[PDB]
Amino acid sequence: MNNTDLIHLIKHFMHNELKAVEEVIDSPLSEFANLIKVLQSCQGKVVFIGVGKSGIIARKLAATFASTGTPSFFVHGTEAVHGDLGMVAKDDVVILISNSGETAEILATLPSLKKMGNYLISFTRSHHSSLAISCDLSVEIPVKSEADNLGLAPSCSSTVVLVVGDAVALALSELKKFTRADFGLYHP
Ligand SMILES: O=P(O)(O)OC[C@@H](O)[C@@H](O)[C@H](O)CO
């Protein structure tokens, strides 16, 4: 493939991701106000749980929440069922990220988390997913397709969830009057 065509091929995939983000910005995001309110009410930490590429985005979002004034950390969904559920205590709020809302490893956390009693939020592509049905607040982040021809590689979905989560973090940060001086304290 010549240089100009290589460049168009790269821009094709970038553009697919751009479209997926646009689809979400153009959507009503009705439950986002309730999402903000639940997060504002959290008296403990916001614990993000995921596996695979969702889990890597969950790690980014925990770090972004923390760096902008909302204490948060990440627990991997498999490590959770091998003891790390012990990191989650009564006042913590749990956000579980799974694009399908069917990932076996993430659903495996749910019986214990129901016993533990924490407020559970899901980020999935469907309110009808197993995970979403089991959570207290389902946030639906619709993703039509992935960017690859096969539609198999998390690309559109991982990027959309990152943009959505970043915007949530920044709205909470602005709402709580997080300052440059607070930012410097956590970023020496
Ligand atoms: O986002 P869910 O549907 O949980 O899928 C988890 C993983 O399978 C996915 O992110 C993984 O990296 C495979 O692509």
Resolution (A): 1.6
Both tokens assigned to 6: 């290589």
CA angle 65–171–110, rounded 5-degree value = 50
| Nearest CA owner, ligand 1 atom 6 | 52
| Cβ count near 74 (within 10 Å) | 25
Q: Specify whether the CB–CB gap between 73 and 48 falls below 8 A.
A: yes
Residue 46 phi/psi, 5-degree rounding, is -90, 115
Quote the number of domains for the chain.
Answer: 1
Task: Name the residue of 48, 49, 51, 106 to mutate for ligand 1: max ligand atoms within 8 A of Cβ.
Answer: 51
Give the CATH number for residue 35. Answer: 3.40.50.10490
**In the sheet that 120-124 helps form, which strands lie side by side, from edge to edge?**
72-76, 46-50, 93-97, 120-124, 137-140
The coordinates were experimentally obtained by X-ray
List CB contacts of 75: < 8 A, sequence separation 6 or more. Answer: 47, 48, 49, 84, 85, 87, 88
Domain range holding 172?
Answer: 1-188
Residues 6 or more apart whose CB falls under 8 angstroms from that of 117 comprise 90
Integer Cα distance of 188 and 180 in angstroms: 12
Contact indicator for 149, 166 with CB cutoff of 8 Å: no
Q: Are 27 and 142 in contact (CB under 8 A)?
A: yes
Written as one letter, the residue type at 3 is N
